[PDB]
Amino acid sequence: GSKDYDELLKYYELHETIGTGGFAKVKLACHILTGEMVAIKIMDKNTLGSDLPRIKTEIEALKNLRHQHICQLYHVLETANKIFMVLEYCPGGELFDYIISQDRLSEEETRVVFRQIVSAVAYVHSQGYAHRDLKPENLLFDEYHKLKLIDFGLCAKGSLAYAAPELIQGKSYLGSEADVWSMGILLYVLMCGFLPFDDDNVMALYKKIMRGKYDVPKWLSPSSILLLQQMLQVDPKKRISMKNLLNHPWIMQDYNYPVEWQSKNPFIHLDDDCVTELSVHHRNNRQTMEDLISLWQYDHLTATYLLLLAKKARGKPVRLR
Numbered sequence: 001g002s003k004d005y006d007e008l009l010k011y012y013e014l015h016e017t018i019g020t021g022g023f024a025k026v027k028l029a030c031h032i033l034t035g036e037m038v039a040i041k042i043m044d045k046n047t048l049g050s051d052l053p054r055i056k057t058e059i060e061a062l063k064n065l066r067h068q069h070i071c072q073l074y075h076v077l078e079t080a081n082k083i084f085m086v087l088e089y090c091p092g093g094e095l096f097d098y099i100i101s102q103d104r105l106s107e108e109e110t111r112v113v114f115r116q117i118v119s120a121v122a123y124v125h126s127q128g129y130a131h132r133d134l135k136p137e138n139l140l141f142d143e144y145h146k147l148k149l150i151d152f153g154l155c156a157k158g159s160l161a162y163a164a165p166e167l168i169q170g171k172s173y174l175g176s177e178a179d180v181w182s183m184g185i186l187l188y189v190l191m192c193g194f195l196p197f198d199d200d201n202v203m204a205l206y207k208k209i210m211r212g213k214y215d216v217p218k219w220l221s222p223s224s225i226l227l228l229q230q231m232l233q234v235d236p237k238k239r240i241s242m243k244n245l246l247n248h249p250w251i252m253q254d255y256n257y258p259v260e261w262q263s264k265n266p267f268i269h270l271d272d273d274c275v276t277e278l279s280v281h282h283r284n285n286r287q288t289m290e291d292l293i294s295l296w297q298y299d300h301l302t303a304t305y306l307l308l309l310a311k312k313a314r315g316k317p318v319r320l321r
């Protein structure tokens with residue numbers, strides 16, 4: 001409805017549609033006070049019913065996962081009929097596009113990308129979650145060519161070609177072991193440009209996945225081949241631990257330090273220039289304003305603070321309209 005938007009258009013001006021998923025439309029928009037571009041995920045609550053609790057788990061998860069390689073949530077706005085999620089804009093497109101335009105990535109370009117994936121998924125597990133839909137369509141590049149993991153609608157506590165054998169059998173599974181399998185599929189796709197398990201017929205592809213045999217192209221280094229085998233194990237108990245992936249020898253090559261998985265931001269002190277400019281727009285003193293930001297309700301103040309922070313990092317004036 002029109003009233004479903006009046007709160008949102010107080011804070012954002014809508015631009016074009018940039019994407020449409022199952023239950024959601026994603027619009028490019030401009031945060032009015034900072035001028036920063038953002039993506040707004042729009043969902044209609046009536047249209048969704050059974051995955052309405054899915055969205056609440058996605059939102060709860062995104063508020064608990066602040067990380068340099070996880071698409072950052074700025075603002076949650078719920079109305080009578082709508083739920084709006086204001087998110088970090090990723091103009092660089094999907095990892096899918098990068099791969100398909102390059103045909104395939106060299107081992108070096110793969111590891112540049114893969115270390116960022118490992119970074120994000122290890123942090124997700126450290127917070128008690130599992131993604132469960134890891135795939136190149138759910139990994140976007142921002143404008144600095146940094147990867148951002150998206151779509152926690154299927155997160156725990158999927159796309160068939162990336163699903164672990166035990167999920168295809170309808171069996172019990174651990175979320176982290178399923179993420180490691182999917183990351184093994186991702187690493188194959190990065191370096192080959194095609195899937196290790198594929199078939200036009202779904203039952204035939206069920207059987208290929210559970211068997212676990214895949215072609216090994218001649219351009220794969222021996223080291224790449226072994227890491228592929230340690231992640232793509234049909235028995236989830238024999239798949240490499242996330243802990244052992246962080247400083248795996250193939251991961252370390254050309255870097256010599258393990259994957260930094262810890263969040264770079266945490267919940268440190270607030271940036272002084274940001275809270276000062278905020279307080280100049282809010283009829284409150286600085287301490288009161290600092291207290292309000294620390295509640296992190298993902299209202300408009302959370303969004304203004306985080307985007308004024310991003311705009312400061314951009315080298316632009318620390319100013320609001």
Ligand SMILES: CN(C)C[C@H]1CC[C@H](N2C(=O)N(C)Cc3cnc4ccc(-c5cc(Cl)c(O)c(Cl)c5)nc4c32)CC1
Nearest residue numbers: 018019020021026039071087088089090091150151152
């Ligand atoms: C088709 N899929 C099921 C979803 C599709 C939605 C559009 C999206 N996109 C695009 O397609 N561009 C072309 C640009 C683009 C730019 N910035 C974005 C910023 C955030 C997100 C985003 C989307 C969703 Cl559904 C999320 O849950 C989260 Cl946490 C984040 N998507 C973006 C996005 C790509 C994936």
